[model samples]
Target: VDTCSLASPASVCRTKHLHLRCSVDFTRRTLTGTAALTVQSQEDNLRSLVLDTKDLTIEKVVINGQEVKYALGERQSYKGSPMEISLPIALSKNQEIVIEISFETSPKSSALQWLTPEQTSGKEHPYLFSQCQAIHCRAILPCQDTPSVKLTYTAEVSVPKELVALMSAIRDGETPDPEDPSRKIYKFIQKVPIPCYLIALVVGALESRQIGPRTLVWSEKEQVEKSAYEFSETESMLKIAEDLGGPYVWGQYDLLVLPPSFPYGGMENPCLTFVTPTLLAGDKSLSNVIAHEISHSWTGNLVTNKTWDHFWLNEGHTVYLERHICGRLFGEKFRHFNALGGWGELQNSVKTFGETHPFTKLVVDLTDIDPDVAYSSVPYEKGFALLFYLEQLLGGPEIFLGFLKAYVEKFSYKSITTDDWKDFLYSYFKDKVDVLNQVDWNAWLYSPGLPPIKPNYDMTLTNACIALSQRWITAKEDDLNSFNATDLKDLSSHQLNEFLAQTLQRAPLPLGHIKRMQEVYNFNAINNSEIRFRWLRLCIQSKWEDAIPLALKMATEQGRMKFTRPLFKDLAAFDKSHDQAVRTYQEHKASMHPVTAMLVGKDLKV
Candidate 1:
């Protein structure tokens, strides 16, 4: 009954049936939805209802068919704007009520806006759309839009003729007009119950591409083709996922690649997945993004968490499944990469806070009150690491996978609390729960500081690099033949470079071997910019003078943005007297990669 706390408001248990009429302008990127609702208030007593209202105006409000004045209250403690109005009549328990509301919007916040000629004239802008699930919606509609409140939504959208309007639900149909070839009205009805936070809508001018029997929609024609080509393996991924878990219940799978401003990498909405254009590597290798989003079909869209407080139920499970499926489909190398990636990301999160902080400390330290904070890498990375550690404690993958499938099956279509997941998991392995419970899961979830996970490399990992480097070094023409696909299978450009460094430390490679290794590094440096930047870091760390020319060459071409910028900074610090490196870097200084550069540009020695 205590609604005073921002963290956990009393549940909005009672349902209100509402009818809404909404209009959208694709050019302006605006939408207005007007609705009337009759509600039975619970203990929280309708302090306010959170709505997605960015640049929104409430034109009219009527209660019991009579005009009533309303005051907008403080925005929801987390992510939405709230409309607070005095009730004309105090509600009795289980009382019937009716209210009418009118809503409208202007170009700034609505999802209907499309890429303008000014935005994409000469430059290639990939069509990407993500319903940031955090930032964008609050700007559009009015509601208690947090994930805790599960509400069903039915939206009717009007858009220009040339553009398509998509949402979480099935497209019922469109009304036609003879005079307006450029405009049409699209209707959406969501029968599957969803939280307001899960409700999404995207309207844009787009071109559709068909790949392997699936139609993918994109904002640009060429990008659509490129995406289709890049994602050609989607069907294979789908089949692999189906074989691993259950079938994909969502009707058809398609991806919407939004423009650059999309906040997150991807959002797993049912039917249509929203992804960032950045994920399109363009050379037919978006496998990680593809696998991550596809795995969401089972873990996120199907089984969902009941509240924002239980975000790990959605994110942790999805991450676990993603790695599992990637491992099965792509190979163990991909799987290990995922594990190490999660570990590294989590370690970074911990280091961001401090080494001693508990996981819950990191969770509590999150400054953003919006529900989106729950999906930040800390939760996904730390939560996945915790789950992975749990899997390790619970014998192996078989026990964990079986338990996960059961968890998914039991909670399918229904919302689950963190306690529910813990109880279920605990029931499967009683003693294991104690080990997991001792872990600061609460700190990880509720705290703001990250828990430390010190990195410890094993002998096998060290030896593997040595052998790989030796093989590359002592090879003739027959050596090229001896190098099998297996050697390259698990070597991400990062792992490969690390291996090369280790190999160099253990034994000097022949000039031919070094050249071959340098060729591999150069190719990756050109193609995989992230790995290329990482290679620069390795060069700085190893002080490999032979590699300095390659680093300078890469810096000249790539202009020291993203991963390179920081690497150059690190390299410059090797000696205060290194004016050339420092001056060259300052002159070519482009913006840093927002995430990595945050740490890289700092004077943090390593």
Candidate 2:
């Protein structure tokens, strides 16, 4: 297996398990800990090991009763420190060894965000969470910091007395400290082997309620009720995914909905998925994001990616499963309708990266590059496009689905590359060698821009949406007096999104025309962020003065890049709203995740 990670030497010293003991200090804004790694030898006469670290203060390393000599090399930008440690002795025959590292994370740790009490939805206690995907895990601890390696681990996290802590592990139990009223220790164990990047942690004032036989929802006290209600369908999604893929291997499917400022819509951390509070749209119009995350339980968390460059394998299949589950719940047309909107997002993402950029390829080169910068809809959307293309070519969904089941079963709990996927695919359909050989695998994997294939979607649900947009596009202001409010009152959020997205304003619409569209549709009243973002951007781009404040509120409330970056750019386009755009950013910058703030900074030319 190969990894694009430049962080650690896990390839030479394979980790089998990790035992982490950490203390969360909100006052210091740090997570101080000792990690004991059980490692196996991967080379001859291996007498030393090198680990990854960034902004971490190392105390000492000990094994058996003896202290080991180590050196923490200087840090480079983005990439962290490389700690070189001498082994006790060269014992090639005895591959099993334990190395204990005493380290404390600095305030500058990339993976961690230290939120003050006022930053959360509930203003009673401070919050701390970890987002370690790509390569941020190194700043958290001395580890491989790559998805190429897997380790089954356990953690004992101590936090303030008033808060609760959670991980991507099963809850063994939590015991309060009798001697210390101001602190508590929580314990968890993850028996399933997971990549280092999947190791997650959250410390805050939290409450949990069982939403299903094997599902629970966690949130701050004030947000738990609606969080549970919005995620009530988790069990149904789990079952739908299981039937579509295979059995749910993870023991429990729990959700932790973070405060408003979570960077991504969802992070599929083994048993407990970390989610954004933005999903609580009241009417469940945005619950499909949950479906997408649930699908990751199989495609990503179960079967793994060998490297970040092959990340599309992890995301593409999950995207397919998500839409498949959607098709199962709603009608098939609804699934196609959503994909149509996703295609628009893909178009936008590719446009952001130049059309011929390697990042637009289904498989991108991550050599000497940040995977996070390389990340875009290319993996999630373009990857899904490739899978959808294959499904259509392989005698439709029924036959192609069998390949999915077998494919997942083969790669379960393991990492793979694109070639591995292709080889297995051809072997699985050996009888159809002629058909298998017909695929242009090189062009699909290496070519830039969109895939050569296009989806033949059943657009029955979108025809009315197109007609409405066409009405707006082809009409003069005088002919708009006949527009009816009833026209879109009955449309689903998905349909409204299509209508708004289709109503692209190449030339800005008249302010009255925008107001009438809103009056009839009442987009302001819509709880769905999808439709809300589309409507809000259209308003801002057209210089509708009334929507300037609305745009600010929405952008401040949610940090998901899908909405914030484009909305900020649209607002900053005209001089009339240029200062408003900069002012809104100043007010809201502190509330955003670093990644979100960084991208918006470029949008405003800060």
Candidate 3:
């Protein structure tokens, strides 16, 4: 018999043979594994071997066909999984031995919480199963549990007949017992060596929909069509991503749209990816997120980060690839604009956090950053911006793209540190390494806040206002031909608003401009539906006080929820007595629209 230490600074133990028997209940979300391990230690040496466990109870332990007394080891805590226990045993170089231990799940376990049917159905929750958050199952099964320790896993799950179980590998098939119709056993065998974090299991009432070559599953039947519509481009996106990041090393790909409260946007779990309901985007505009996650199939999924301390390897690389894929599928202009937009957004995030402390200071230990806080547009934004900047400095798209391919190919299936990436960059741009390293990558990686940068726009208010007034004067009443469509199209929403405000600041506000604004107000006042509700908001900001009567008329005539609700709020703040009325608007709730409604709503406050 052979014995080995599965502890840190791992001791290699050569065992003659080992056998493992495990049972998993998909519905209950519980797993119990019993293992008989035999291995050889030092000659004539007697020592105990430790096994890791979490909120799991050890039922029994035995060694060499004899019952052995075992105690929990030093790292014993009720909180962590992969619970460890040491068993005393004696062995020589040629000794043969066998050890067995049994375990069960804790009822109130935070490591892994089995969802009840009631919890699953009420919230349009994520039907797909996920094991990434809170690190639960690692507490149950004792293996070298870290992203760096890649190992092969074989799992056999016991589920009720009505429930289906899906894991990260291809399903062999299922066999039914002669007498049990209500209970079924499903077995999955994954031969590939993968990180424990990528191991995932989903069990529930799931219905599958086929799109392109992939089959997508959803928790609810009605959502299948909608989910299919949302994921329609997944296959193409995957193809384009593979071209940028090499081939799809993961054998197969499928998506599982879990119910509403699916904590994060998505988790790139090997074969089966988990997504939130918010991404459904009934109209199917979530392609960017989809591209981002699919790109992770290479950066984060295939070639994993060496440590949580090097999360930029996982995240930054994925973002770069996402933009690359988007560029190839769309156009260079789209990609450039997308990256530019990200840089602008990161600048804003940094400004919001204040100037004294920039975002770059945050990357002390990648693992320490909270997922809730770290997983934002900042990492993606700043990372993409930095990558774009690097690309610009290093030459063009070809150079950067080739460098990425070489980097990923060199580091596939392995973990790497930030220094590793910097070294790779330095290899290409040797002269630039000093400046690059001094750029405070750590601050952006580990910090919670943004950087300090003042907002700047190239346009002035007076010129913009005068131009707008002149355009209104020249355009016909029915045609907006007087306005420069090209200039308006080029201006960002902020710049356009600045121009409008500047026009109002000029002497003797143009009557034609005012009339054109009123025409716009009248057009919006008549359309009182929820979708067009924003029009009323735009009219208010144009300061069309004359349009107030029209707004009141729309409010009284429609009595619809959308129009009347906002109209009442606005009218309550209206002042009939003052020579110069000042309208104060309340805060508008945050939404998904590209421009904040508050921007337009507050403009109409009077």
Candidate 4:
């Protein structure tokens, strides 16, 4: 049984197929319709079926074409409320039951965000999208919200014809409503089984440009061409991912660039990936996020993680694969450079959670805790650290990659646990059992704080950044004259970004040091958000009063949490800008995504 999930009696019955018929109402901000599930009883004498729900209004339930009685249980925090439908007759083992529930979603559903016309890029039509990762899918519909249960689904979504509707599955066809000409019915089907969190839906005034043979980049007309150019390398990245892992089972590898409020980098929805327009950096410098999502096509989507507790099985493997893709496209050093940046991120996450926090462990105990609160870079980078260590211990990348491909093929459509993955790893590398036995599992997997072992990354690309940052960090007031614009002329954007990040790791620099460095580097005028984010953080850490407005502009302009959260925290910590930071967040809170705004509020104690 999944501990984090609210779906009970899940052991007795399993969902096999799902069909959803829903009509979108922009005025009321709801999806009203029926969720028809075909479930099979696993044990004899199954008297009822239990499903998960949150803020969903249930109109009726039907069994065997007859109305049935169902009760909505008390609301449980985070897990939401449970719906129990009493079976008309006891079911024998292996018996199939078709259950249907008519429901309507609440306007305040956490899983959904209904944007006004002004909130959208086009500023003409309203927008609707769903973000159901971790444990929020129950807010959208009644079904088993656990990742342990996988099912094929078909959806018939009715939306205004002027707007396009997309799902996490293949687009079947579209038909004009014979009954209501104003609405159009869009059909979608997913043959490959997937968990509920991957069930994504987006509806808006959108247009698409073909970026590759099997890929399309979709966004409002304002950003469509820019997104197409930014992600034009998607087909090449997919080929690299396939070469490293196995085949991409999901038919289409399309992408939809969401509005500025998308909290995460990208959601690896089956046929379509939902991304933030923040990745459209004009120069394709930030497109590595696309590679990471592409890697999820095999790691997270194919070889599933049975529970959020074992999330590293998904993210850790994906990060490893993502860096490998970058390495293949660039070179080995560039891959290690990316890995080093991840290590720095992991360090920041650990500090934010504190060294002794349980959430810092590689395997987190999420009992009674919201997975979103516990979410951080630990799973992504800590998991990669483990796999990276194993690569060196067992053999090397070429050999470890073979095992990764095999692992994906072995558990393609199944949701599995950490022990399941461990057993498979042991068997696959039977010849290296002696070496593996000498490894320390307890310290690495269970302990908090930093990882047990630091990976031996090739510092060829980072050494210059390290040296330059050290010079400024150790420079005295008199030595400031030694710095000049040429000090940064040789550094690439990646190196320059690292230099700023490295400087941020130290105690706040002297105000004079930052002012002098800024004069020579001219970071105030940089366009790359990564470099700009780090430079602003470095400036703020020095208590520079002039940097406050610049920092807030960077934080609110684009809602990428990676930059916004840290900038907010730094500003809130500074005595001079503490009030201003909170006031600014309050002013822009309505424009920010719910998740981002909520987390930032916690940071500011508002």
What residue runs in model 2 are displaced by over 4 Å at the alpha carbon? 1-4, 8-11, 505-507, 587-591
Question: How much is 133 displaced in model 2, in angstroms?
Answer: 1.1
459-526 in candidate 3: lDDT tens per residue? 33234534664665455655553433455555433334334433433323344555655444333432
**Lowest summed lDDT over 10 consecutive residues: which window, candidate 1?**
1-10
TM-score of each: 0.72, 0.96, 0.65, 0.97
Candidate 1, residue 156: the lDDT equals 71
Tens digit per residue, CA lDDT, model 1, 315-351: 7777888888777876665676557656655655566
TM-score of 3: 0.65
Cα lDDT computed for each candidate against the true fold: 0.57, 0.83, 0.55, 0.89
Q: What value does the lDDT take at residue 306 in candidate 1?
A: 57
Quick one: best TM-score, which candidate? Answer: 4
lDDT of 2 by residue, 64-174 (tens): 878999997876666677888888888483488999999999876778888998888778799999989878888888887777788999999889888999999999888
Error of 4 at 179 (Å): 3.3
> Which model, 2 or 3, shows the larger lDDT?
2
